[PDB]
Amino acid sequence: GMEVLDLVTGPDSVTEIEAFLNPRMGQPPTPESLTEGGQYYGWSRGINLATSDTEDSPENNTLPTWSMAKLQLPMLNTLQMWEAVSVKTEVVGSGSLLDVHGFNKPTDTVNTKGISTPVEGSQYHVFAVGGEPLDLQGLVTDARTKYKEEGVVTIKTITKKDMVNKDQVLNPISKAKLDKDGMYPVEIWHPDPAKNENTRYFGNYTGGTTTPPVLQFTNTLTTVLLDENGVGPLCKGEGLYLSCVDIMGWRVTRNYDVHHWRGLPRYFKITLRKRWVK
Amino acid sequence: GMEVLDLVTGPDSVTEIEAFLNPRMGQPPTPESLTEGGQYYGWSRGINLATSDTEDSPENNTLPTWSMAKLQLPMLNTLQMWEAVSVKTEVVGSGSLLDVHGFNKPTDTVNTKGISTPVEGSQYHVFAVGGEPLDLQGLVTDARTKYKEEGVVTIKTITKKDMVNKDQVLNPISKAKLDKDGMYPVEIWHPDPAKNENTRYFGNYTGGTTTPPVLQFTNTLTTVLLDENGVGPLCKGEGLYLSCVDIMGWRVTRNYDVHHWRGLPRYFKITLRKRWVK
Amino acid sequence: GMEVLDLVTGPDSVTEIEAFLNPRMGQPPTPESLTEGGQYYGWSRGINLATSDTEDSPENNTLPTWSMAKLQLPMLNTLQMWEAVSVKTEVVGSGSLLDVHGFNKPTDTVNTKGISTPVEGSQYHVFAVGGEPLDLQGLVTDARTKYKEEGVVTIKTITKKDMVNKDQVLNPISKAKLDKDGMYPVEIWHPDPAKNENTRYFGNYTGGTTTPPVLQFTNTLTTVLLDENGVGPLCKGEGLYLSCVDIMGWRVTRNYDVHHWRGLPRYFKITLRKRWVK
Amino acid sequence: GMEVLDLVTGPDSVTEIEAFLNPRMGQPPTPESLTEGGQYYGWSRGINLATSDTEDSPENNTLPTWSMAKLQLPMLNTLQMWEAVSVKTEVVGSGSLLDVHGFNKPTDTVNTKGISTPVEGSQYHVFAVGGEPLDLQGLVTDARTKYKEEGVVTIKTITKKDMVNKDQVLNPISKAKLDKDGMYPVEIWHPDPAKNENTRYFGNYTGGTTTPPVLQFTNTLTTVLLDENGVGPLCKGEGLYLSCVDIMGWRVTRNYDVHHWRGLPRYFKITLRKRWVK
Amino acid sequence: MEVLDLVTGPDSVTEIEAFLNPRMGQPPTPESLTEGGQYYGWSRGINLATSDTEDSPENNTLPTWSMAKLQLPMLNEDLTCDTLQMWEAVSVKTEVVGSGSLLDVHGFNKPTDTVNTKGISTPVEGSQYHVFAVGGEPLDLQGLVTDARTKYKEEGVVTIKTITKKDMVNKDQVLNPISKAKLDKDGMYPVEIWHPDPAKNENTRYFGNYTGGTTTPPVLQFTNTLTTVLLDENGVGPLCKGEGLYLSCVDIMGWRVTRNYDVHHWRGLPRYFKITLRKRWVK
Ligand SMILES: CC(=O)N[C@H]1[C@H](O[C@@H]2[C@H](O)[C@@H](O)[C@H](O)O[C@@H]2CO)O[C@H](CO)[C@H](O)[C@@H]1O[C@@H]1O[C@H](CO)[C@H](O)[C@H](O[C@]2(C(=O)O)C[C@H](O)[C@@H](NC(C)=O)[C@H]([C@H](O)[C@H](O)CO)O2)[C@H]1O
Ligand SMILES: CC(=O)N[C@H]1[C@H](O[C@@H]2[C@H](O)[C@@H](O)[C@H](O)O[C@@H]2CO)O[C@H](CO)[C@H](O)[C@@H]1O[C@@H]1O[C@H](CO)[C@H](O)[C@H](O[C@]2(C(=O)O)C[C@H](O)[C@@H](NC(C)=O)[C@H]([C@H](O)[C@H](O)CO)O2)[C@H]1O
Ligand SMILES: CC(=O)N[C@H]1[C@H](O[C@@H]2[C@H](O)[C@@H](O)[C@H](O)O[C@@H]2CO)O[C@H](CO)[C@H](O)[C@@H]1O[C@@H]1O[C@H](CO)[C@H](O)[C@H](O[C@]2(C(=O)O)C[C@H](O)[C@@H](NC(C)=O)[C@H]([C@H](O)[C@H](O)CO)O2)[C@H]1O
Ligand SMILES: CC(=O)N[C@H]1[C@H](O[C@@H]2[C@H](O)[C@@H](O)[C@H](O)O[C@@H]2CO)O[C@H](CO)[C@H](O)[C@@H]1O[C@@H]1O[C@H](CO)[C@H](O)[C@H](O[C@]2(C(=O)O)C[C@H](O)[C@@H](NC(C)=O)[C@H]([C@H](O)[C@H](O)CO)O2)[C@H]1O
Ligand SMILES: CC(=O)N[C@H]1[C@H](O[C@@H]2[C@H](O)[C@@H](O)[C@H](O)O[C@@H]2CO)O[C@H](CO)[C@H](O)[C@@H]1O[C@@H]1O[C@H](CO)[C@H](O)[C@H](O[C@]2(C(=O)O)C[C@H](O)[C@@H](NC(C)=O)[C@H]([C@H](O)[C@H](O)CO)O2)[C@H]1O
């Protein structure tokens, strides 16, 4: 398990696996009906605001959460372990944001004309590949936020106690593991840099309200997953963990400026090799 | 030929081919008359907006589509195939956007003075070179969008069924191939990262409504098309596929802020070599 | 030891230490109460403005200060010294800025709708690793600013005299050392480039009032601390000094646009090796 | 001089030539008088707008044109040719844009106060070095634009016929050579990527109306002119061609927001070597 | 001058440091914080033209180049010797200090809430200009102005007219090779007039950048880990003529805006230089 030896050679010593992770912006995949809520799939529901400085209770379907998948690798067996060497990853569908013919708040609000305002604002892109769940560190805007006690994993879920003022900075007690898809809000749970020895993660954030969204995509870019010692994530029990979130901004409706988060799916193609371990 | 062998040497073992792909923003090349619609060539027609949350019917000539060309390579036939090594590509005509003396919405709307507002807003630049058609993955803003059944290839064209809520995220069923110029809307069809083993594509997106357009151009830049194994796209049946879209933003008229998409043509110069295959 | 010799080899000759430094934006860690002030931890209190050109008296809890920590390394004693080779550092919690459901100034102020305006504006990111306290150089916007005498270390604290007009530019008399956490205002005290021979510091500033905050984070980036001669900071008396400030911008309230600074915590993982010295 | 052989060695086998090209924004160098039009030298005259969708008649002195110069090299004549190896090029005078004390549209228009608004907006920087005139490809915003017949070289000058709708995209008929300084409008004529085998060009465009101008300048940067085969432009008949345009944006007056283009001069220092040719 | 081998031995390499304070318009004196000294590090309030033909900026509203000449140790007892030694500038660590001070948003500038006169004191924003140079002789300057009609003061600033003894011509709005000078005095050459001359400066390295606009966010990086190489393409750094080393800079961060008629004041910051020099044999 611990001591890393030579690369295994011979038939089937290398494998490639691919997966797509759909975004988890708030509306679940079901109901599928385009008149019963399914029309919001790929988006959050309308963001609901605090009613006072002491009453902030966001609905679960307004909170983007981490996407995750655990993939099973070919059975193995000094022992052998699968080692993640590299990944090609791509966020797909930015071209869909060129739809400016819909019924969003129009650019000319005097005549109700122009174009349907495209998705704009705060953007958040993180992906990770590891041999165990992504380790998470909690940190919130407001320790007083009344997150729901059902259907979501928050700091109180883990500690069994209300949040404290330290949860607005780094409180080492407030940790979790990304072990469920669509359950851990991204405004609460961050990659833990004090752990994640067996995972590589890459994140970026751009804020603002009207910020132009930016994205690049190509099938020619490889992300190396080997550490400073030439060792990739080692997959415990032949399980490979993929984690991501890809927020593009908000669309804004014609009714009291209601905002809906927009997310996009992420492709992963991971190259793995067998590694001798002791 | 699946197995890639040595490079072919001797007379005419290397070739160089060039092409330009004109943009397909909505107005077709004909009619040519500058009073009958030809004056909009290089642009879309005026973007028409949804009339309700459930009534979004964009006209075909308001939707930018993929440009594509299939080029015939010198005849050949252990067999030989043409291998695309590199490409020099350039978007031509950004200097034309320095025309601020026209009849667009003026910069001083109070007095109808200043300059004619230049093209601004959302921008989209993708090119691809491959030995078969570019593989496409469908993904839309709104699965309820009522695209025309004739004159465009959309998800319904492929599936023979209405779009589903999954089409707003990644639905593996919604796939196509870029086999026709000016027919596949870019707000629907994206490069499929799960396929395109024999094509290289490079894309970028910048959104917003008044975003400054940015472009670089030079005859000194070479894009390598060789993969991680040193193998370029292999041209099946001696056909080379070029695909692109180059949206610079919109111009805005003096009449109810009507927007017209602006596109620019793309130059390709591809270097190819003969490769032994079996 | 001033003369640097060979690296020490053998058992325990290399060590790794980690720490997090919480931000010091103005509100202290106590009281912890989420009603009596603890709700502002990780933030400043409401920024108070000058009442005239000659009356600028900022409150201590409105002034972000440097974070610092002195870490004790393993006992060592031609002598040996600990040498800081490299650091992996990360600013944690940018995802928490995606909370736009609170009670900040809303994006639609006419109807009190839209979203809770996220953190925006001036940003400041500096970190340092050294074998002694970070050397500081004073420089202020206004030498007339009346800082509190107690509770902050300012130029007057050091000189025992009022600031002079030269303190608005570079005055070599106005120097200090970063020897206390949460005490040295970042609008006064800057890394001194004329000293810090035994410290590496890295800073950036982005100004403005509504500027989108930008942050990257990954566990794959290593910052080398070796100088041009291959020598890292040497830890005097086995003490390692970490210093930082990470301002993301301000939040704005619904009452007279009151601004509160937002800061985020910084993780450090330092690799050290024993060095022979004479 | 088709087959390129060895480099020539010996006395005077390498040479350096320098030149500055002044901008050609619309006002000619004469009259010199600062009351008769000379005050506009370095700028365009006030941009005049179309009066309808079918009446766009820009005046020649409102249209920036390409700068060019043909330089004579030392006499030479297996023959020898001058080969351009590299160029150091710089745009001079960006500091002059720090003049915000003039009579431009003020930053506070409510009270007519503040500062004189500095040059802002669309920017266009292109330079070329070659052994023959820069090859130009025509492309316009509007094929209906009524350019003057005398005083500018436009598409009609070349074809002897009105522009066609194809001229709004890539029309290979619409070609020219940059053989005159201050005559070819940059909104019409672009470097032709299908030609220019013996010229290197480098261009960039940034659009918008109030975009901050950006410029870097240093005497430490060398641009290599050698192609992929290590051969620079070969100077036919010992003539070296320099081409450029450097638009910084517009100034805006206090009278009906009249805009004037601003251009800056470009320095070139070219290193050339003698090459044996057959 | 033929450049030969590097000199070896005791004291063949040296490091020297200096800070250059900004020259935004208000001189260092008077020092009093009620008599004008409160503006040191800033310009005085920018005064505007009163017509298209009447543009008379005051000297204290015009940022000028900072410069310093440093004298290095004498190397040659006898200049008639066939082979001599010169100081060669190899590299420089340079840093603009004090961007953190722009985080003061608690002052009496134009406030961000103009309805209630609340919010924050608007931070420094707008046009930015960063140039530094290191050379073995003064920085060569090329004149180029926005307006050849600008009526600069004849005393207190070095302008094109100072040099030519004649009024500016329309050519001075583009490149006029007649309009040249050398940066031989601190706080005297306006940066809206005088630019590094790319046709000279063979013995100087300069690095400049400009970002315009009115409300543009200021951006700055600072670190003690970044070395700027001064060696040319042939491996030779600036050679110090008569052992003189020239440092030149300007670092404009933008303007602050007051509560009285949006009066703007330029803000500048000081720049640190640490130059590594070595002795070089020459003939
Ligand atoms: C429909 C509704 O009012 N829903 C409330 C919910 O109301 C419950 C109950 O469901 C309802 O039938 C009954 O009349 O009243 C009770 C109690 O009030 O109560 C919950 C609180 O637990 C919410 O307040 C909920 O409101 C919805 O909350 C969503 C976030 O959870 C979101 O903001 C909804 O807003 C949208 C939406 O996302 O669905 C925003 C969207 O832009 C709108 N679409 C269009 C085309 O206008 C829709 C739309 O108005 C409704 O979905 C149509 O019914 O709302 C918000 O309604
Ligand atoms: C002219 C018109 O109304 N066209 C309609 C079209 O109407 C047809 C037919 O043309 C008309 O004579 C008849 O009365 O009605 C029938 C059908 O009822 O119907 C189609 C839908 O079937 C469209 O509604 C069409 O309207 C045009 O739609 C275009 C998008 O497909 C686009 O928005 C047009 O808008 C522009 C244009 O691009 O042509 C915008 C442009 O900026 C305008 N130019 C100027 C200088 O103002 C032009 C211009 O107003 C018209 O083309 C008239 O010359 O319109 C939109 O008109
Ligand atoms: C509460 C108050 O007035 N505090 C004053 C303080 O007043 C003291 C004393 O506390 C008070 O009981 C008594 O009436 O008066 C004495 C002094 O005469 O005096 C100090 C100066 O010595 C300050 O003037 C202080 O005012 C606070 O100053 C803070 C900066 O130091 C800051 O601006 C406070 O503003 C906030 C805050 O950060 O606490 C801004 C925040 O957004 C507000 N929150 C909400 C939800 O509205 C709070 C809030 O109004 C109060 O904290 C609730 O009491 O204020 C500012 O109050
Ligand atoms: C002076 C004038 O009206 N010029 C016209 C010109 O008019 C001629 C003739 O000169 C005039 O005496 C007579 O009454 O009418 C004839 C027309 O047959 O006609 C040409 C077209 O043939 C133009 O319309 C011209 O107008 C000028 O056009 C320029 C573009 O070519 C430009 O827009 C001029 O605008 C400026 C300028 O650049 O000179 C803008 C500038 O900001 C202004 N400066 C100030 C300080 O206000 C000047 C200024 O108003 C005048 O130049 C002062 O005479 O104009 C535009 O005038
Ligand atoms: C005070 C004044 O009017 N100064 C004039 C100057 O006037 C002289 C003399 O000083 C005065 O006593 C007498 O009445 O008139 C004579 C002759 O006119 O004249 C010169 C021109 O020769 C200027 O017009 C000067 O005005 C000053 O010009 C400066 C630029 O050179 C600058 O714009 C001054 O503006 C500021 C300043 O920088 O000092 C802007 C600053 O924001 C202001 N500070 C505050 C806290 O408001 C100050 C302030 O108003 C004055 O300094 C206090 O009197 O002015 C501008 O005044």
Instruction: Give the DSSP per-residue string, chain D.
Output: --SEEEEP-STT-EEEEEEEE--BSSS-S----TTTTGGGTTBPPPPPPPSBTTB----GGGS-B-EEEEEEPPP---EEEEEEEEEEEEE--GGGGG---SSSPEEETTTTEEEEPPPBS-EEEEEEEESSPPEEEE--S-TT----SSSS--HHHHHSS---GGGGS--TT-EEE--STT-SBTTTEEE-TTS-TTEEEEEEEE--SSPPPEEEEESS--EE---TTS---B-GGGEEEEEEEEEEEEEE-SSTT-EEEEE--EEEEEEEEEEEE-
Q: Measure Cα distances from B52 to A44, A254, B57, B140 in Å.
A: 20, 10, 10, 18
C113 and C242 Cβ atoms separated by less than 8 Å: no
Partner-chain residue, chosen from D48, D53, D190, that has the shortest CB–CB distance to B93: D190
Q: Where are the alpha helices (DSSP H) in chain E?
A: 160-164
CA dihedral sign of residues B8, B9, B12, B16: positive
Q: From the list C142, C170, C206, which residue is nearest E270 (CB)?
A: C170
Inspect the interface and report whether the beta carbons of A113 and B50 lie closer than 8 Å.
no
Task: State how far the Cα of B42 lies from the Cα of B26, in Å rounded to an integer.
Answer: 8
The SS3 assignment for E12 reads: coil
Dmax over CA atoms of chain D, in Å, equals 74
List of residues 6+ apart from D264 with CB closer than 8 A: D23, D42, D91, D92, D93, D94, D246, D248, E144, E174
Give the span between the Cα atoms of C195 and E272, in whole angstroms.
11
**Tokens 């963990």 sit at which residue?**
A241
- The closest of A245, A203, A205, A193 to A122, measured between CA atoms, is A205
Write the Ramachandran bin of C237: left for phi over 0, alpha for psi from -120 to 50, otherwise beta.
left
User: CA E21, CA E235: separation in Å to the nearest integer?
Assistant: 31
Q: Show the ligand 2 pocket: residues with CB < 6 angstroms.
A: B 40, 45-46, 48, 59, 61-62, 253, 255, 258; D 53
CB contact under 8 A, C53 and E19: no
- Cβ <8 Å between E191 and D95: yes
Q: Which of E120, E130, E271, E273 to mutate to test the interface with C (most CBs of C within 10 A)?
A: E120
Give the pocket of ligand 5 (CB within 6 Å): C 53; E 44-45, 47, 58, 60-61, 258, 260, 263
Residue listed under structure tokens 């981490």: A66
Cis peptide before E30 (omega within 30 of 0): yes
Paired strand residues for A239:
A72
Ligand 4 atom with minimal separation from the D253 CA: 42
Q: Would you say the CB of residue A61 lies under 6 angstroms from ligand 1?
A: yes
Experiment used for this model: X-ray
Resolution in A: 1.9
Q: Give how far Cα E236 sits from Cα of A234, B155, E15, E75, E233, Å.
A: 51, 64, 17, 18, 7
The residue type found at E107 is G
Q: How far is CA C166 from CA A91, C66, C174, E59, E190, in A?
A: 53, 23, 9, 20, 22
Q: Of the bound ligands, which one is closest to the alpha carbon of residue E59? A: 5
Chains B and C touch (3+ CB pairs under 8 A): no
Q: Which CATH architecture has domain E1-283?
A: Sandwich (2.60)
Q: From CA E146, how far away is CA E191, in angstroms rounded?
A: 12
Using CA atoms in the order A149, A153, A156, A160, what is the torsion angle rounded to 10 degrees?
90
Interface probe, candidates D205, D222, D252, D260, chain B, greatest B C-beta count within 10 A? D205
Taking the CA of residue D117 and the nearest CA in chain E, the distance in Å comes to 7
How far off is chain C from A185, nearest CA to CA, in Å? 9
Q: Ligand 3: which atom is nearest the Cα of residue C59?
A: 31
Nearest 5°: the CA angle E97, E102, E107 is 140
> Would the CB atoms of E212 and D119 count as touching at under 8 Å?
yes
> Could you write out the DSSP letters of every residue in E27-69?
-S----TTTTGGGTTBPPPPPPPSBTTB----GGGS-B-EEEE
CA distance E79 to chain D (A): 31
Which residues in chain C have Cβ-Cβ distances shorter than 8 Å to E97? 137, 139, 170, 190, 193
Q: After which residues is chain D broken (C to N over 2.5 A)?
A: 77
Q: CA of D98 to nearest chain E CA: how many angstroms apart?
A: 6
Distance B256 CA to ligand 2 centre (A): 14
Q: Is C117's C-beta closer than 6 angstroms to any atom of ligand 3?
A: no
The total of other beta-carbon atoms located within 10 Å of residue A172's CB is 11
Ligand 3 in reach of C38 Cβ (< 6 A): no
Choose among E37, E97, E123: nearest Cβ to C170: E97
* Partners of E70 in beta bridges: E245
User: Other CB atoms closer than 10 Å to residue C177's CB: what's the count?
Assistant: 17
Ligand 3 atom, smallest distance to C40 CA = 38
- Whole-angstrom distance, CA of residue E175 vs CA of residue E170: 10
What whole-number distance in Å separates Cα of residue A67 and Cα of residue E163? 69
Residues of C with Cβ-Cβ distance to A201 under 8 angstroms: 217-220
Burial status of residue B181 (CB atoms within 10 A of its CB: 0-12, 13-18, 19 or more): middle
What residues of E are in contact with residue C141 (Cβ under 8 Å)? 101-102, 104, 107
b/e burial code for range C69-93 (CB count within 10 A of at least 16 → b): eeeebeeeeeebbbbbbbbbbbbbb
Query: In this complex, do A172 and C106 lie within 8 Å of one another by their Cβ atoms?
Result: no
Token output for D129: 């070095």
Other CB atoms within 10 A of residue B1 CB:
15
- Please give the DSSP secondary-structure letter assigned to residue E125: B
The number of beta carbons lying within 10 Å of the beta carbon of residue A133 is 21
Answer whether B261's CB lies under 8 Å from B14's CB: no
Annotated domain spans of chain E: 1-283
Ligand nearest to the CA of B105: 2
Interior angle at CA C32, CA C29 and CA C33, nearest 5: 145
Evaluate the CA torsion angle C34, C35, C40, C41 in order and state its sign: negative
Candidate from C258, C260, C261, C262 with most ligand 3 atoms within 8 A of CB, to mutate: C258
Q: How far apart are CA B199 and CA B225, in angstroms?
A: 9
Three-state SS for chain C is CCCEEEECCCCCCEEEEEEEECCCCCCCCCCCCCCCCHHHCCECCCCCCCCECCECCCCHHHCCECEEEEEECCCCCCEEEEEEEEEEEEECCHHHHHCCCCCCCEEECCCCEEEECCCECCEEEEEEEECCCCEEEECCCCCCCCCCCCCCCCHHHHHCCCCCHHHHCCCCCCEEECCCCCCCECCCEEECCCCCCCEEEEEEEECCCCCCCEEEEECCCCEECCCCCCCCCECHHHEEEEEEEEEEEEEECCCCCCEEEEECCEEEEEEEEEEEEC
Does the distance separating the beta carbons of D193 and B267 come in below 8 Å?
yes
Q: Could you tell me if the CB of A58 is within 6 A of ligand 1?
A: no
- What is the sign, positive or negative, of the torsion defined by CA atoms of D208, D212, D213, D218? negative
Token duo for residue D111 = 């009270």
| Best D27, D103, D111, D219 residue to mutate vs chain E (most E CBs within 10 Å) | D219
What is the Cα–Cα distance from B250 to A98, expressed in whole angstroms? 11
Closest chain A residue to C31, measured at CA: A165
User: Rounded distance, CA D217 to CA D215, Å?
Assistant: 7
Phi/psi of residue E171, nearest 5 degrees: -60, -25
Q: Is the CB of C109 under 6 A from ligand 3?
A: no
Q: Is it true that domain C1-278 has CATH number 2.60.175.10? A: yes
Task: Report the C-alpha gap between E278 and E269 in whole angstroms.
Answer: 29
Instruction: At B112, list the tokens.
Output: 């109808």
Q: Which of D128, D2, D5, D14 is nearest to D73 (CA)?
A: D14
Residue A94 Cα to ligand 1 midpoint, Å, equals 28
Q: Do chains E and C touch (3 or more CB pairs under 8 A)?
A: yes
Query: How big is chain C, counted in residues?
Result: 278
